Structure formats: structure tokens, C-alpha cells
RNA sequence: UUUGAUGAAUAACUUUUCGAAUCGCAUGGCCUUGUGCUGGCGAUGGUUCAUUCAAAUUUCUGCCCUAUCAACUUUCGAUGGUAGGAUAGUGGCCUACCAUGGUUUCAACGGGUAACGGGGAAUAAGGGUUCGAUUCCGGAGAGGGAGCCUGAGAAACG
RNA sequence: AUACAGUGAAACUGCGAAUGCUCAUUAAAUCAGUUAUCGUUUAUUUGAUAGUCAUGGUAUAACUGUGGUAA
């Protein structure tokens, strides 16, 4: 049950000090330094799950890899972000090009767009 | 180039006969780059207290190099400037370009020359084609706008008047100084 | 901790009294900053209220003045040569208030010769400055008195010595030499 | 004085704090005494 | 000798310019107490440097004004005055004499010997055991 | 991790990333607003002194603002703990091989003691100290102060047993060889004195020497050798002497670096190379083949060194510095790295293939 | 303890409210404000105890932020705003004003006040000083800091200020022979002409005052407020003239 | 000679602090009808100073029995000076450098005090013989020594 | 209402959370009184108070999903 943390060169579980703005450690009370045990950065013969990321495609279309594709659930908030997404300019408003998300409620068909930040 | 390390880093190595100086031929070679960056830092306006201290630091740093070096700096100032129409003619300038941009450049120039005289009062040099032509050049079109423009251009009239005042003041001070 | 109470000194009668309370927060004494000379590293302390008090532990550059004609520039320090409190302090060169330092002469002589036109040593009446002053101009190493608490201000301000001050300090050095 | 004057008196907290120590000489002291005599003084 | 201590004993924030020449070497600052007291000419011409001097040092005298009788004068720059005053004992309804042996910093501008009605005023705390400073002298 | 020199591979595994002319505080703040092995190997203002345990398992080092001591644990590569101090500790020693018992000379003319239970009490030394060494065969804490005072207080009693008066105005170092339990006193009047316990008397006085400036020295460093035979010393002009004890003449001389004072000399054991470590405050430490006086290597930390130490086994040089991360060096040609640091071999393999 | 205090018993209430002793267990603590707490009157006491306009705390809160009570021109939204001595509380819905002034028994007293007399309020001028940009500011007893006052204003003065704009109009310098209002000390409530002053630097400046039974009496200068000359007050004082029978 | 009037910024230095990229409502006026300009009445913040709530030290005034307690302090500076660090701030609070002091039979000092003590502190006893009711006790602790952290205010001990 | 405006959980952020019981006894100590702070600090209260880009970049939490471990 212990995780992998980048930086500590040992293939052994270590009791380190873990802090606020770092990985693997989500403290309850704000800002302190607690002592916690994490499994060191060198992968050894005792690990259980390893996380790897596809970078360059090879030969095989794999279903849960290549065939599946989630859409991004959320969308932009800022008008300049909308500009950067769509290739807009300073002059045209984005009230018409804000993303339109459609919802149903029984048979009523309502829809929403976010409040434009800035 | 960094701003938060600008002044301190200048005093770290750019101060002469101390720690980490620059060799003769090399420093001769890297004159233009120092000149360009210091011209940029001068062209930064002193609209805040930090920018005030930065401009004060810039002008305090400048006069410690050497006479041809600061002459080259003043030469780059004149090169941003010009005197060609006025001094190919006697006193006439054919291209009637006395725009607000031109006079703004002139006022920046008279600001920096006021700065360098005030820092190197009894020591700074006077190159002929470097100071004399742009000074009376700027004063000439200052009075040209003062004469040929009515009060409808309060913007032009105000900063032409201040341009005239500063040019005359620095002319008087350079006379007192050299 | 390090306190500045009176709750430990002997009474004026000359007897030891009773312990009163655990030592508080406001009656605190912080840790003394032996400010050395070097790459300027400043450290902030949050003191009572929202007050910020700076402790620079090292420095090269201080702000120095002549009231001889009223000029003041930021210069690079050189060394510690006297201080009335402790010989060890003078030795290890941990600058304090009222310290006697050797300071550079270069920007000051640059201003002097750019402001007068007369070479130092080697406005006439004002140009007849003091002889030991121009001798130290020739030496390139001036005597200054840091007259500011560094471990409170986080700054280092000094003034170059003048006649009777320089006289007594020179006498101090020549008696200690 | 404050601490300048050498108050020769026993200290309780450092009485047996490092008392005692076994004599870990790697010498027999005899030739080293002859040798210290036969040092650079001779 | 006036400057016989380790540092240059001078009155701070006081500038003398050696350029323009003068009559007395250092223009010596001194302010007035007010409060009915008069500044002394011995302090005005006084060449001593006492930052605890009520006239020439940078100390303020605002508050209680008392007086006392000196017994011992064997310190530097400070003395102890002993004041035997009447004390009332109501369970006997009898009076008694009780003396406070209270100290006070003195200025060298005033020379005080045993047998002195000295008028003092309190200040901000001067040292560990003193908060008074002499202003007025009446020796006998 | 950086490798710079050509004859020999240095490895700045720790510490600064930019050498010189970049302040760590502003660079750190700017980089955070825009690898390492020990968790929090820092003191955020500067560091002063380092000594590693003979157990080879703790590393204890002092730090300057909020003057404190960090004890690091190799079994966990982090702070075992942190402990504030009353004043900026000057120099320390570790009584037992463990991290527990420690005792040190402290800038306010005093000393402090430390245990796993925290702290044991302080005593004001009469005059301003310079160095403290503990004779181990019988418990003798002895301190060289300025002047002519070698106070020798035993721990059978706790009393200040006896001062060794000296013919000197200034003492600046003391040391001892563990076999030859002689008190060696290096005093900045160009003089070294040799004393012996159970005699409490001078064994020798010597080391009057000369430089090109012909100025009086400041005898900075004294150190022993594991032979119990040869001692070395180091002078303020940056000049080191290796003396066989049987000769008054210098067996080996070392005009090294620049005229800044040599500040730590520590020999090192390799079966091939019995060598010497000479470091000064001109941001250089030098690695000399002792037998011929051949400078094998040199490490350039690019910030001021406050102390140097090596791991007893092989491989790393811990340097205490003026900069923020006090750092260390793995020399492969020196040898491997010990029991808590075993894969830097591999990572220097990728940086060598780099 | 760890800081200031927030609860306070009925018995510890200051006298010049004239309360009972067992309406509750804790008294309304004054808010911190433009008057000192040891001499101020909170509006809940004023509108619950004295004038009986309201009778429960929630009710008086309800009126206060029905926004009817105006204090010193402005409106308040405090349940415990510290109204103080010689002050102004009006009310629009009754079309009335009340100048608050001390009595001879050391207790507060309302004075029914018409509109134009309520238009102004006096202030004991504490001190004037040169602030930034070299301008002068004058500070009264009640936190009133006014730029550009009279140069003839000295310390220990009395200035009448119109309240519709918060601006100084009139001034009286304390001299000998003035209509004092005694505020503190032993002898609060006895109003007559002063006799004179004894000066005590490092100490006090005592004032001898002869009241209308031709009786003199000595009070601290800090307890002095200035009204005017004899036979002309700037305030419509009530019946009694500071006389206790 | 009086009656009355006036006073009695420079040089730089620095992690920039700043001089609002924030909520409730005016709808007009003018022509350039752009939806252009312009604007008024209500909230949240920020610069400093005052004032308020507090807090820190501090002047002096007051409390038992006992000399079967005559010594006490420099053995953490005891007393004082000078200088510096430290503190929000003075001050031996702390360190150097020094001087060698202070308290005392007017009994210092010391001892015991049942010091659950006393304070008109507290409302009183609207007539109990002295008695009620309230308030301050004073400090420390929150497994135990040691060290650190924020906030205006903590040496917080959940 | 084709930007939202009602309402609103999770969270950012502002402020409070410095007004709990048990154990130990000091005679200028404490406490009461009275000062001083031309010698200090102050969140809050109220009062004044600063001519020196038709709008710049970020990020998260939550959510989605995939997992680990007896926890």
C-alpha cells in the first residue's frame, strides 16, 4: 500500500518528511511537516503496480489504449482562453461562441454555458 | 539583463579595479552591448520609486568606463537622433517632420544628456559632431513649433516649450561645465 | 528560551527571590546575528504585531556619507580594523554598530575628480581638503565608521571619519600597534 | 568574576558523564617515553 | 582627560564642520528642562559627555520631583541619598523615623558632597536601580 | 550531479546548480515561481561545521541562522531531528560513536552538552576559545583559547583541572594523534608546542618558519596522521607542511592555490593512494598524493567552504559552505560509496555515458 | 488572561447609567468606539433603560437597523454604539433631538433639543499638530481630526462644529473667568465661573472655580470643558444650573 | 518708550510599499447616434495618522510573628560606568571594557506564618452584636523533560 | 434568458476558534492605590488622509477514469 516518490534513491520503504506543495502526500492540518513512509524511487522486486505512459505508438491498435478516447468533460472559463481556442480576435464577442452544454430533465431540454471569466 | 539582479550584479563585476573585471580587448569588443542595454534601461521611464532608483543607478554607473566609450554612447544617442537636413543646409530643414514622436525622442535625449553632464560635471568630454548639432537642432525645431504653431496644439506646445527649456538649460550647463 | 526578563537578577537587597511564572512571549530575546562580510543574505523575522525586522547576515555594500560636503553613496566594504567592544569581534570581522572599517576609495575619488577636476594627492579652497584624507585617497583605502545596527535594520550605514574622530581612532590604532 | 576566574570545584552533572574510560593505549609507554626524550630535542 | 574611554565619547547627532572655522571647537547642543528649573552655565560650557546628564544628554524629565540628603559619594557619576522621613503607626498612634536609601545619577556639572539638599526628578529608567536624576543643588 | 575535471571525475551530486554569480535566494524563488538524496540537506543561510559518526550512520552538522544543529540519519536520508542553539556554535565533537553524546565550544565564551534527552548544562570558559579536542583514552576535554591558555578539564571529576600556560599571545589550533596521545598546539606565532599527559609538560616547541613575504604566519591548521608518527600543519599564506616528527626540516612543502589561509587538512586512506586534503576559503579543496607531493585532484565548490570532511569508508566528501545547500562530492577513482548510497554508481554511469 | 475581556457582570456597570442590579447577569458591553468606555453610554441602555422606547434587545436591534436613529448626523447600526458625553442623538420619527450632558449627581441626562440647536456640537480641543505636507490637524476629545483649523486654536480649547458638514465654525480659548463645565474628578456637576489656575509641571494644573452659590473648588485641568462667559452659554442647559438641593 | 502684529529640504540607500485590473443603482445631456462621450447616489480594500479595545514595563503609597535570626550580596553582574547585541521599547536584560560596590540594628537578612489567606475587593447586615452575598486568590499543569511553528494578542500544549 | 442572474451541495478565500478542569503557597512578592511612557505595541472601533489597461498571465479543488493496500 505504499506509493512511489521521485527523488529518493533507494529500493526500500523510507520514513521521510512530507509537506504541503509536493506529491504523494495530502495533509489534513494546513502546512505542517509530517513523518510518513514512502517506497523509494528505484523500482525493485517488491513493487505491485507500475504506472507507465504511452509516448510513441507502435504496431498494434489496442482497445483500451488506442480505440478508446475520453472527451474532456469541462471547458474554458476565460474570454482570452476562448480566443486562444477558436482563433478569435479582440473585437468579436464570445457570448455567441461560448460552449453550449445540453441537459435533459424528463422531457424538458435545457442547456447551459459558463459565466465568462474576464 | 535581469532586473532584480541588475544593480547588485553591476556592482559585482562592472565596478572597476575590484572583483571580476573585464580584460582590455574583450571590454573594447563588448562595448556595444553594454551601450544598447543601458540605453534600454534609460528609455525605461521613471514612473515609480523603483524605476527612479534604477535610473539613478544607471546614470551613476555610466561615467566610470573611459572617454571614447562614453563618446560612443553619446554617438549612439546622436545616431538615434540626426542632424542631416539642418547641417547639409545652413539652417533650413526640408522635411517638416516635427511630430510628437520626434520631439519625444528629442526630450528623452535632452534628459539623458542632462543626466550625463550632471554626473560627469567637470570631467565629461565634448565631441563636435555629437553634441553641438543635435542641441541647436532640437532648439531650432522647438522654436519652429513655438513660432509656426498656435495654441490649438497644447500637447505639442507644452512639450515643445519644455524641450526648449531643457535644451537651453543643458546648453548653459555644458558651457559652465567644459 | 532566550528571555530578557528581570525575573532572574538579584534584588537590590542582595537576595534571591521566588520563581513567578513561565517565561512569556513578549519578554523574549531573539538570537544574535553575527553579521559577517560576504554575499548578502537577508532573513526576515515577524515581530510582534505584523512588524518585519530584517537580519542581513552578510554584506559587501553599505551606504556611506560625508557631511564634509554632504554626499552619500553605496560602496563596497573591504575590512574590519577596529571596534571598541571586542578584540575578537574586530579580529573575525563581524561588523556591528560603531565599527571601524576599511572601505573603498574609488567611486568617491571618481566623484571628487569629476566634480573638481583636481587629481587627489600627487573651487580651490574647497579643493584644499584634509591631508590625511587625500593620503588615504592615494592609499585607496578609507576609514569609515558603521553607525547603524545591522542586526536590526538589515542595513549598513557608515560615515568616513573626520579630524578629531580620525585622530582618536588613529591614536587608538597606533597605541594598539 | 563572571567566568574568567577559575573556580576549581567539582561538577555534579559531568561527574560520571564520561567517567571512567579503559586505557586504550596501543603502546606500552616505555619506548615512547624514551622516544619522546629522543625526539627533536635530541 | 575627557575622552579616556574605549570609544570616542561624543554627543551624537551633533555635527561640527572643520571647513568653516569657529570659536569653540564643538557647538554643543543642550536643551531646557522647563518645569521651573534653570539650565546651568556650567552645563552650557560643560565639556563632559554624559548621555545620562539631564541637560546635555538625550534624557527627559517628566513626572515626579523629589529631594533628598546624600550620604555616600563613592561611585562614578552617581550617588546614594538617604531620606529619613516620618512614618505613622496607628496601632500605637506613634510616629517613627524611616529612611529610604535611594540612589541617583548625578551630572559632573554639579559638584555634590555629603550634607546636600539635592532636588531630583524622575526619568525613564536609567539603570537597574535608578530612575532619578539630580537637577538642583543646595550644599552645606 | 555534475562532472567537470578531465583527469579525474568530480561529482557535485548535491548543492548549487549554478556555480558563481547567481544568488540562490532570488534564483530559488524565481525558479519555484516559474536528483537530490537527503531530504532537506540545507540550512537556508549558511553552514559551518560537519563531522560524521564513526558508526557511519548519522551525519551531524550545524547551521547558522536560527543557529541550530541538524542530525541526519542515513537509515532514512532525512533529518533525524533539528535542535536550536543559544548562540552560533563554533566547534564541536562527538563523544561516543553514536549521535547521542555531543559537546561543543560556543561563541559566547561557553560550552554546551547534548544528549538524546536534549541538552546538558553550559559552563562559561574564562576566555574566548578557539578549538576543543577530547582525549579519549582518559576523558579529557581540553580547549585552546586565545592568549596562552590550554584549559584541560577532566570528566572523571568535571573540574577544570589545569591550564597549560604557553609562551604565546595567540593560539589557533589544537589536535592530538590517537596513538601518540600528545597535545599538539598550533599557535599563530609560527610556533607549535607538544605536550604529554601524566607529565603535563612541554615535549617540544618548534615550527618557526618563513615565507616569501617574510611576515609572521598565522598557524591555521594542525592535523595528525594515522601512523602516530607524522603531523601536518597549515599557514595563513596558504602554505602546508608535512612533517615527519623525527625531523625539524619540512618533509614535504605545499604552496597551493592562492594566499588565502589553508583551513582544513585531512589525509585519506586508499591502498594505492595515501593522500592529503588541503582546503582554503578560496573555494578550492586539493587532493595531493602525499608521498611525492603530487596534487592528484581538486574540487571547486564555487562558494566559500566552511569545512570539509570525508566519509570514512570511501567515496564522498561532505563540504560545509556559505551557500544554501551544503553539499558533497562522489569521487569514483577514490572508490565506491557506502551502505546507504549504493546506486550513485549507476547514476554516474548514465552521466558518464552523457 | 490571554487578552481582552468580553463578558461583564451587572454589578460592575459604571454608575452613570443608573441601572438596576438584576435585569440580567451580564451587562451590555460598550463597543469600542469614538468615546472611552468608562464614560460612554451604549444605545441599548439609552433606548431600553432610560427612555423606554424599546424594552427587549432583539426589539432595539430591530429598530436600530430599521435605520431611524441618527447619531452625530450619521446613522448607526450598532446595538452597542458608544454614545458619549455632550453628544447628539436625534430621531426622525418623533422629530426630536437630545443633547446628552452630565448632571450634578454624576449621571447622564438627556436634554430635549430642537433642530437648529442640534445642528451643532462642541468639542474639547485636545491638541493641534503639524501633520504631513506641513498641514495642521486638530484633535478633539472624541476622535475628531480636522484639517486646517484656526491658528488661534491652542491645546485645551473648545470649538463648536456644525454637524451637517462636519466643519468647524466657532472657537473659544480657555482663559481666566470662563463658564467651565466640570466633567471629571471629585466635583463633577458644579458649574460656575472659574477662579484661576495653579500650574504644576511634571504634575497637574489645578483650577479653582466659583459656582453660583459663590463657592470655589479645585479640579483637574483634564476635567475641564469650556462653554463660554458668564450669563451666556452656547448650550440650552436644563433647569438646575448644576445645583443639588 | 506702549496699544497691537510675523517667524523664531538635500545627498543617496532598498526584493518595492504603493497611487483599487472588486460589488449596489443613475439615463440624462450632446451629436460625432457612436449604442460615442459624459456623469451622479450605495458596498468591499488600500497609505498614514489620530482615536478606541487592549497589552507591556514603571513612579510612589500601603500587610503578620520573630534577633532563640547579624550579617547579606559579588559562588547568572553583586553596585555603577562606557560600548554593542537583543527586544515592539528603556534598562547589566545579555557580552565586552572596566571601576569595587550595595543592604543593615531605623534589625537588613533569616526563620516560622495553619498565606483555603487577605483585600471597606465586594453588595452590605432596610436592626444577626459584626453577620450575610459577590469579586481578586497567586502560579503551574493538560503522559514526562527538550525544541519549533501562526496570529493583533499564545511561549496555544486537544 | 442563445453568458449567467432563483436556489444550491463539494471546495477557494476572509475572520473567529487567545472569553477547559486538575494540582503547588509567595509577606514590597502579590494585591489594592497612585503615577510615567519626549520610551513602546495594537487585528477591531470611529475620524481624517494618496494626480506623481474596451482590461496581462495563471492554477486548483471538485469532476471523469484507472489503481494500490488488511488500513
From Swiss-Prot, chain A:
Keyword set includes Ribosomal protein: yes
Modified residues (Phosphothreonine): 104
Highest taxon, organism lineage: Eukaryota
Sorted UniProt keywords: Cytoplasm, Isopeptide bond, Nucleus, Phosphoprotein, Ribonucleoprotein, Ribosomal protein, Ribosome biogenesis, rRNA processing, Ubl conjugation
Gene Ontology biological-process entries: maturation of SSU-rRNA from tricistronic rRNA transcript (SSU-rRNA, 5.8S rRNA, LSU-rRNA); translation
Residue location of crosslink Glycyl lysine isopeptide (Lys-Gly) (interchain with G-Cter in ubiquitin): 57, 72, 90
Extra information: Present with 66000 molecules/cell in log phase SD medium. There are 2 genes for eS6 in yeast.
Name of the protein this chain belongs to: Small ribosomal subunit protein eS6A
Source organism per UniProt: Saccharomyces cerevisiae (strain ATCC 204508 / S288c) (Baker's yeast)
GN (gene name): RPS6A
Curated annotation (Swiss-Prot), chain B:
Compartments in which it is found: Cytoplasm; Nucleus, Nucleolus
Subunit annotation: Interacts with snoRNA U3. Interacts with MPP10. Component of the ribosomal small subunit (SSU) processome composed of at least 40 protein subunits and snoRNA U3.
Function: Involved in nucleolar processing of pre-18S ribosomal RNA and ribosome assembly.
Family: Belongs to the UTP20 family.
Name of this protein: U3 small nucleolar RNA-associated protein 20
Phylogenetic classification of the source organism: Eukaryota, Fungi, Dikarya, Ascomycota, Saccharomycotina
From Swiss-Prot, chain F:
Keyword Ubl conjugation belongs to the record: no
Keyword Phosphoprotein assigned: yes
Taxonomy, superkingdom: Eukaryota
Start-end of each WD repeat: 42-82, 166-205, 214-253, 257-298, 300-339
UniProt-annotated location(s): Nucleus, Nucleolus
GO process terms (BP): maturation of SSU-rRNA from tricistronic rRNA transcript (SSU-rRNA, 5.8S rRNA, LSU-rRNA); ribosomal small subunit biogenesis
Gene Ontology, cellular component aspect: 90S preribosome; nucleolus; small-subunit processome
Keywords, comma-separated and alphabetical: Nucleus, Phosphoprotein, Repeat, Ribosome biogenesis, rRNA processing, WD repeat
Record's function text: May be involved in rRNA-processing and ribosome biosynthesis.
Family statement: Belongs to the WD repeat NOL10/ENP2 family.
Subunit structure: Component of the 90S pre-ribosomes.
Protein name: Ribosome biogenesis protein ENP2
Native source organism of the sequence: Saccharomyces cerevisiae (strain ATCC 204508 / S288c) (Baker's yeast)
Covered residues, full protein: 4 to 366 of 707
Swiss-Prot record, chain G:
GO CC terms of this entry: 90S preribosome; cytoplasm; cytosol; cytosolic small ribosomal subunit
Top-level lineage group: Eukaryota
Record-given protein name: Small ribosomal subunit protein eS4A
Function per UniProt: Component of the ribosome, a large ribonucleoprotein complex responsible for the synthesis of proteins in the cell. The small ribosomal subunit (SSU) binds messenger RNAs (mRNAs) and translates the encoded message by selecting cognate aminoacyl-transfer RNA (tRNA) molecules. The large subunit (LSU) contains the ribosomal catalytic site termed the peptidyl transferase center (PTC), which catalyzes the formation of peptide bonds, thereby polymerizing the amino acids delivered by tRNAs into a polypeptide chain.
Note: Present with 573 molecules/cell in log phase SD medium.
UniProt-listed Pfam families: 40S_S4_C, KOW, Ribosomal_S4e, RS4NT, S4
Subunit structure and binding partners: Component of the small ribosomal subunit (SSU). Mature yeast ribosomes consist of a small (40S) and a large (60S) subunit. The 40S small subunit contains 1 molecule of ribosomal RNA (18S rRNA) and 33 different proteins (encoded by 57 genes). The large 60S subunit contains 3 rRNA molecules (25S, 5.8S and 5S rRNA) and 46 different proteins (encoded by 81 genes).
Presence of the UniProt keyword Glycoprotein in the record: no
Similarity-based family: Belongs to the eukaryotic ribosomal protein eS4 family.
Post-translational modification Phosphothreonine, affected residues: 114
Location of this chain's protein in the cell: Cytoplasm
Residues carrying Phosphoserine: 31
Cross-link named Glycyl lysine isopeptide (Lys-Gly) (interchain with G-Cter in ubiquitin), sites: 61, 133, 160, 167, 173, 178, 210, 232
Annotated organism of origin: Saccharomyces cerevisiae (strain ATCC 204508 / S288c)
Amino acid at each position: 500500500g505504499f506509493p512511489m516518490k521521485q527523488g529518493v534513491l533507494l529500493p526500500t520503504r523510507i520514513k521521510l518528511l512530507l509537506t504541503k506543495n509536493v506529491s504523494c502526500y495530502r495533509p489534513r492540518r494546513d502546512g505542517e511537516r509530517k513523518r510518513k513512509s514512502v517506497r523509494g524511487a528505484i523500482v525493485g522486486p517488491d513493487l505491485a503496480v507500475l504506472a507507465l505512459v504511452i509516448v510513441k505508438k507502435g504496431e498494434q491498435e489496442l482497445e483500451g489504449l488506442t480505440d478508446t478516447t475520453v472527451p474532456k468533460r469541462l471547458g474554458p472559463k476565460r474570454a482570452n482562453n476562448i480566443r486562444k481556442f477558436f482563433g478569435l480576435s479582440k473585437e468579436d464577442d464570445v457570448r455567441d461562441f461560448v460552449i453550449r452544454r445540453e441537459v435533459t430533465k424528463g422531457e424538458k431540454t435545457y442547456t447551459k454555458a459558463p459565466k465568462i471569466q474576464r | 539583463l535581469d532586473d532584480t539582479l541588475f544593480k547588485d550584479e553591476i556592482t559585482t563585476f562592472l565596478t572597476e579595479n575590484g572583483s571580476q573585471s573585464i580584460k582590455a580587448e574583450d571590454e573594447k569588443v563588448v562595448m556595444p552591448y553594454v551601450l544598447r542595454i543601458f540605453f534600454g534601461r534609460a528609455q525605461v521611464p521613471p514612473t515609480s520609486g523603483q524605476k527612479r532608483s534604477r535610473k539613478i543607478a544607471v546614470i551613476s554607473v555610466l561615467p566610470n568606463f573611459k572617454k571614447p566609450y562614453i563618446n560612443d554612447f553619446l554617438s549612439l544617442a546622436s545616431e538615434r537622433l540626426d542632424y542631416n537636413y539642418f547641417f547639409g543646409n545652413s539652417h533650413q530643414i526640408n522635411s517638416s517632420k516635427a511630430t510628437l514622436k520626434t520631439i519625444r525622442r528629442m526630450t528623452g535625449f535632452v534628459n539623458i544628456v542632462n543626466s550625463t553632464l550632471s554626473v560627469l560635471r567637470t570631467n565629461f568630454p565634448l565631441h563636435t559632431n555629437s553634441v553641438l548639432q543635435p542641441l541647436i537642432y532640437s532648439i531650432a525645431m522647438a522654436y519652429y513649433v513655438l513660432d509656426t504653431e498656435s495654441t490649438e496644439e497644447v500637447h505639442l506646445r507644452k512639450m515643445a516649450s519644455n524641450l526648449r527649456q531643457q535644451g537651453l538649460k543643458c546648453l548653459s550647463s555644458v558651457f559652465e561645465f567644459v | 528560551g532566550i528571555s530578557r526578563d528581570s525575573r532572574h537578577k538579584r534584588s537590590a537587597t542582595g537576595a534571591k527571590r521566588a520563581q513567578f511564572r513561565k517565561k512569556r512571549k513578549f519578554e523574549l530575546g531573539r538570537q544574535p546575528a553575527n553579521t559577517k562580510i560576504g554575499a548578502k543574505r537577508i532573513h526576515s523575522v515577524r515581530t510582534r504585531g505584523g512588524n518585519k525586522k530584517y537580519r542581513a547576515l552578510r554584506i559587501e555594500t553599505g551606504n556611506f556619507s560625508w557631511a564634509s560636503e554632504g554626499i552619500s553613496k553605496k560602496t563596497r566594504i573591504a575590512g574590519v580594523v577596529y571596534h571598541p567592544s571586542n578584540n575578537e569581534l574586530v579580529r573575525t570581522n563581524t561588523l556591528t554598530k560603531a565599527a571601524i572599517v576599511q572601505i573603498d576609495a574609488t567611486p568617491f575619488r571618481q566623484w571628487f575628480e569629476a566634480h573638481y577636476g583636481q587629481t587627489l594627492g600627487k573651487r580651490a579652497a574647497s579643493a584644499k581638503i584634509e591631508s590625511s584624507v587625500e593620503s588615504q585617497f592615494s592609499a585607496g583605502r578609507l576609514y569609515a565608521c558603521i553607525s547603524s545596527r545591522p542586526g536590526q535594520s538589515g542595513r549598513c550605514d557608515g560615515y568616513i571619519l573626520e579630524g578629531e574622530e580620525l585622530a582618536f581612532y588613529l591614536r587608538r590604532l597606533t597605541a594598539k600597534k | 568574576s563572571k567566568g574568567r576566574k577559575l573556580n576549581y570545584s567539582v561538577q555534579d552533572p559531568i561527574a560520571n558523564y564520561e567517567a571512567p574510560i579503559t586505557s586504550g593505549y596501543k603502546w606500552s609507554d616505555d619506548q615512547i617515553d624514551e622516544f619522546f626524550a629522543g625526539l627533536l630535542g635530541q | 582627560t575627557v575622552q579616556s574611554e574605549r570609544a570616542f565619547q561624543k554627543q551624537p547627532h551633533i555635527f561640527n564642520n572643520p571647513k568653516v572655522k569657529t570659536s569653540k571647537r564643538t557647538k554643543r547642543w543642550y536643551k531646557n528642562a522647563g518645569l521651573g528649573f534653570k539650565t546651568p552655565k556650567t552645563a552650557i560650557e560643560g565639556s563632559y559627555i554624559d548621555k545620562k546628564c539631564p541637560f546635555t544628554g538625550l534624557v527627559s524629565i517628566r513626572g515626579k520631583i523629589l529631594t533628598g540628603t546624600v550620604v555616600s559619594t563613592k561611585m562614578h557619576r552617581t550617588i546614594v541619598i538617604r531620606r529619613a522621613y516620618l512614618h505613622y503607626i496607628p496601632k500605637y498612634n506613634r510616629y517613627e523615623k524611616r529612611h529610604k536609601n535611594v540612589p541617583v545619577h548625578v551630572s559632573p556639572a554639579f559638584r555634590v558632597q555629603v550634607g546636600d539638599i539635592v532636588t531630583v526628578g524622575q526619568c525613564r529608567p536609567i539603570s537597574k536601580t535608578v530612575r532619578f536624576n539630580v537637577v538642583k543643588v543646595s550644599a552645606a | 550531479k555534475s562532472t567537470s575535471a578531465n583527469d579525474v571525475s568530480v561529482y557535485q551530486v548535491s548543492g548549487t546548480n549554478v556555480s558563481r554569480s547567481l544568488p540562490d535566494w532570488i534564483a530559488k524563488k524565481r525558479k519555484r515561481q516559474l536528483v537530490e538524496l537527503i531530504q532537506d540537506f540545507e540550512f537556508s543561510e549558511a553552514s559551518n561545521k560537519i563531522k560524521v559518526s564513526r558508526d557511519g550512520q548519522y551525519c551531524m552538522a550545524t547551521g547558522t541562522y536560527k543557529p541550530q544543529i541538524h542530525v541526519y540519519d542515513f537509515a532514512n536520508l532525512s533529518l533525524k531531528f533539528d535542535r536550536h542553539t543559544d548562540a552560533e556554535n563554533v566547534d564541536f565533537t562527538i563523544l561516543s560513536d553514536d549521535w547521542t553524546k555531543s559537546v561543543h565550544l560556543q561563541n559566547d565564551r561557553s560550552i554546551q552538552f547534548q544528549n538524546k534527552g536534549g541538552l546538558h548544562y553550559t559552563t562559561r570558559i574564562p576566555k574566548f576559545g578557539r578549538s576543543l579536542v577530547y582525549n579519549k583514552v582518559n576523558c579529557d576535554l581540553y580547549v585552546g583559547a586565545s592568549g596562552n591558555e590550554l584549559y584541560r578539564l577532566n570528566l572523571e571529576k568535571g573540574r577544570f583541572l589545569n591550564p597549560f600556560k604557553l609562551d604565546t599571545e595567540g593560539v589557533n589550533h589544537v589536535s592530538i594523534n590517537e596513538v601518540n596521545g600528545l597535545l599538539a598546539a598550533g599557535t599563530e606565532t609560527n610556533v607549535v608546542e607538544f605536550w604529554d599527559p601524566r607529565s603535563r609538560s612541554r615535549v617540544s616547541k618548534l615550527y618557526l618558519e618563513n615565507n616569501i613575504d617574510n611576515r609572521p604566519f598565522q598557524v591555521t591548521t594542525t592535523s595528525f596522521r594515522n601512523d602516530g608518527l607524522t603531523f601536518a600543519c597549515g599557514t595563513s599564506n596558504g602554505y602546508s607542511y608535512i612533517y615527519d616528527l623525527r625531523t625539524s626540516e619540512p618533509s614535504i612543502i605545499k604552496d597551493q592555490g592562492y594566499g588565502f589561509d589553508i583551513k582544513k587538512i585531512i589525509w585519506l586512506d586508499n591502498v594505492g593512494t595515501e593522500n592529503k586534503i588541503v582546503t582554503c576559503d578560496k573555494r578550492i579543496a586539493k587532493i595531493w598524493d602525499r608521498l611525492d607531493g603530487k596534487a592528484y585532484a581538486s574540487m571547486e565548490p564555487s562558494v566559500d567552504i566552511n569545512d570539509i570532511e570525508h566519509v570514512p569508508g570511501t567515496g564522498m566528501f561532505f563540504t560545509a559552505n556559505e551557500s544554501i545547500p551544503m553539499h558533497t562530492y562522489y569521487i569514483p577513482s577514490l572508490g565506491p560509496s557506502p551502505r546507504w548510497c549504493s546506486f550513485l554508481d549507476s547514476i554516474t554511469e548514465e552521466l558518464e555515458e552523457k | 488572561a490571554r487578552g481582552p475581556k468580553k463578558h461583564l457582570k451587572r454589578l460592575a456597570a459604571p454608575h452613570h447609567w443608573l441601572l438596576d442590579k438584576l435585569s440580567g447577569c451580564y451587562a451590555p458591553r460598550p463597543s469600542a468606539g469614538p468615546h472611552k468606555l468608562r464614560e460612554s453610554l451604549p444605545l441599548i441602555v439609552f433606548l431600553r433603560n432610560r427612555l423606554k422606547y424599546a424594552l427587549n434587545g432583539r426589539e432595539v436591534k430591530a429598530i436600530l437597523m430599521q435605520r431611524h436613529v441618527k447619531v452625530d448626523g450619521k446613522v448607526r447600526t450598532d446595538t452597542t454604539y458608544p454614545a458619549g458625553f455632550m453628544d447628539v442623538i436625534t430621531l426622525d420619527a418623533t422629530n426630536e433631538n437630545f443633547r446628552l450632558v452630565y448632571d450634578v449627581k454624576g449621571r447622564f441626562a438627556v436634554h430635549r433639543i430642537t433642530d437648529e440647536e442640534a445642528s451643532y456640537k462642541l468639542g474639547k480641543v485636545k491638541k493641534v499638530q503639524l501633520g504631513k505636507k506641513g498641514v495642521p490637524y486638530v484633535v478633539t476629545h472624541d476622535g475628531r481630526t480636522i484639517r486646517y483649523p484656526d491658528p488661534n486654536i491652542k491645546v485645551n480649547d473648545t470649538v463648536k462644529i456644525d454637524l451637517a458638514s462636519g466643519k468647524i465654525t466657532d472657537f473659544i480659548k480657555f482663559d481666566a473667568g470662563k463658564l467651565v463645565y466640570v466633567t471629571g474628578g471629585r466635583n463633577l456637576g458644579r458649574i460656575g465661573t472659574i477662579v484661576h489656575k495653579e500650574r504644576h509641571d511634571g504634575g497637574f494644573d489645578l483650577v479653582h472655580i466659583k459656582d453660583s452659590l459663590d463657592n470655589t473648588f479645585v479640579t483637574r485641568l483634564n476635567n475641564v470643558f469650556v462653554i463660554g462667559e458668564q450669563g451666556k452659554p452656547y448650550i440650552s442647559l436644563p433647569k438646575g444650573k448644576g445645583i443639588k438641593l
